[PDB]
């Protein structure tokens, strides 16, 4: 009963979070095995951020300039390396809390859990979707950089994102754990274009399905629509075009509810064209696209 | 930058979660020190639930009938006791992960983090507010009973709630850790009245403040209102009456934004009377009352 945005437990990732201080900059780092991963802008000052020649800036820096701290214990840095926009600091100690883990570059529309931290200490945890434009809508203050997004699959933690930059929209941009930014963004204090953010249609249709499963079916219509015809309305409202694969994924849901995907699409088409007339689906007066079909299934199944 | 509903890290509570099985019922239990806390309806069958004489039902049950399991290890139950609607099972082993903790009965309007579990295993984590009518809007399936709500204060975990019952609204009801239900609810499968749910006004005014802090100020009006006059409009729209203490709490916020509390109340009064005209505050097309003024401050401060 009830459907809520739900983050994965943070316990395993909690133990992998360390304070990284370079000069006057302090942020968060991820300690797995002998390596601590941090955004490379820890080396940069305010002035450095505007035009950073990170290669040149790193040459000045040396292992002893990096202050890695777990709790109240410091780690011996015995090597620095810069992979893309992330710096990997080799340390003497393996993290004994290092869990089964993978590093995955996530596809747009996918979702993950952010463990937001400050000075190596976990503050809180919330769900995020990788927006199609490769931004995210998080909560990130100064020193939250290095905070990571993850999914869990039983024992394994698939790390997918590391917070690096805030955009003037208010939204956020970051890398995969190999240091490649999601999107056309860079670690520089320059004007940055957060392009047209489109709605993850498949994810809204899953939420609609989730609503039906929880007994909200006011939106339901008496008719259907075609892929082509639906997408003709999707485009107008800046929705991602729906694909046959999207349909296939929304199948178990379609099945479980005894409702066809295109009939659901027709209900969305009315909801877009006509609005919601002051009503709410699942306690929300607008359409939610940060719910993957797996996410809806996982709550409905009750997977742990 | 950005404001998101945010749960407390779940790591410490994760280690305090155990599977409790009585006969054919399995649910979640909280292992702190030598005691495991669980909803007493674990003893009850389906038929037992309709008219349970828990005193009589417990006399039949004996320690060996209680299957407490952590991971893949079982605990020796050496005593059972029923405090109100919670059963405390003494076990041989102390939880070595038992953290600094308190048991607090929470006031309505207060918020907490739910660590939703199944069979003793944490599934996910989300924020909840204790609705004025003493229900909550969670996500709880069969076997999520025993899942607990908590707040953290640095080292200490203040446990405040334990999930016990689902109401036909879809919403949820549970106890404090001493086993007293929040509200006029009971552990019985009977029709239960989830009375008029009023809006936590102070919490909406904090969210409005949080929006201002994040740069959303379209709602802002050019005028003010009085306590009496505002509450005259609050009542109509099923809002909690605003108190001088509510004002005092919303002070640091009022201060930080350079906006007076009653001017904010006037903006709310328009928002209530007139709606939102298709616009959104903080990515939401309706007013949010699950944000305590402390909650808004904690994100804005960045407390860890």
UniProtKB/Swiss-Prot annotation, chains A, B:
<feature type="cross-link" description="Glycyl lysine isopeptide (Lys-Gly) (interchain with G-Cter in ubiquitin)">
    <location>
        <position position="5"/>
    </location>
</feature>
<feature type="active site" description="For 3CL-PRO activity">
    <location>
        <position position="41"/>
    </location>
</feature>
<comment type="subunit">
    <text>3CL-PRO exists as monomer and homodimer. Only the homodimer shows catalytic activity. Interacts with host FBXO22; this interaction promotes the proteasomal degradation of nsp5.</text>
</comment>
<feature type="topological domain" description="Cytoplasmic">
    <location>
        <begin position="1"/>
        <end position="304"/>
    </location>
</feature>
<protein>
    <recommendedName>
        <fullName>3C-like proteinase nsp5</fullName>
    </recommendedName>
</protein>
<comment type="function">
    <text>Cleaves the C-terminus of replicase polyprotein at 11 sites. Recognizes substrates containing the core sequence [ILMVF]-Q-|-[SGACN]. Cleaves and inactivates human TRMT1, preventing tRNA guanine(26)-dimethylation of tRNAs. May cleave human NLRP1 in lung epithelial cells, thereby activating the NLRP1 inflammasome pathway. May cleave human GSDMD, triggering alternative GSDME-mediated epithelial cell death upon activation of the NLRP1 inflammasome, which may enhance the release interleukins 1B, 6, 16 and 18. Also able to bind an ADP-ribose-1''-phosphate (ADRP).</text>
</comment>
<feature type="cross-link" description="Glycyl lysine isopeptide (Lys-Gly) (interchain with G-Cter in ubiquitin)">
    <location>
        <position position="90"/>
    </location>
</feature>
<feature type="domain" description="Peptidase C30">
    <location>
        <begin position="1"/>
        <end position="304"/>
    </location>
</feature>
<feature type="active site" description="For 3CL-PRO activity">
    <location>
        <position position="145"/>
    </location>
</feature>
């Amino acid at each position: 009963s009830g459907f809520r945005k739900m983050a994965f437990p943070s316990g395993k990732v909690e133990g992998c979070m360390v304070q990284v201080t370079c000069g006057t900059t302090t942020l968060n780092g991820l300690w797995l095995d002998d390596v601590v991963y941090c955004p490379r802008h820890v080396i940069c000052t305010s002035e450095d951020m505007l035009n950073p020649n990170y290669e040149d800036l790193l040459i000045r820096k040396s292992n002893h300039n990096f202050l890695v701290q777990a709790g109240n214990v410091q780690l011996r840095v015995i090597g620095h390396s810069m992979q893309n926009c992330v710096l990997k600091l080799k340390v003497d100690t393996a993290n004994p809390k290092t869990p089964k883990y993978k590093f995955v570059r996530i596809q747009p529309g996918q979702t993950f859990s952010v463990l937001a931290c400050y000075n190596g200490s976990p503050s809180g945890v919330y769900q995020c979707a990788m927006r199609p434009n490769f931004t995210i809508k998080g909560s990130f203050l100064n020193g939250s950089c290095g905070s990571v997004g993850f999914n869990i699959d039983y024992d394994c933690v698939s790390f997918c994102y590391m917070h690096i930059m805030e955009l003037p929209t208010g939204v956020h941009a970051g890398t995969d754990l190999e240091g490649n930014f999601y999107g056309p963004f860079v670690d520089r204090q320059t004007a940055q274009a957060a392009g047209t953010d489109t709605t993850i249609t498949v994810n809204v249709l899953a939420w609609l399905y989730a609503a039906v499963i929880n007994g909200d079916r006011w939106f339901l219509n008496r008719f259907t629509t075609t892929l082509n015809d639906f997408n003709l309305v999707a485009m107008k409202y800046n929705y991602e075009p729906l694909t046959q694969d999207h349909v296939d994924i929304l199948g178990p849901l379609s099945a479980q509810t005894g409702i066809a995907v295109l009939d659901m699409c027709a209900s969305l088409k009315e909801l877009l064209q006509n609005g919601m007339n002051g009503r709410t689906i699942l306690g929300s007066a607008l359409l939610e696209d940060e719910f993957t079909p797996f996410d809806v299934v996982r709550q409905c199944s009750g997977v742990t």
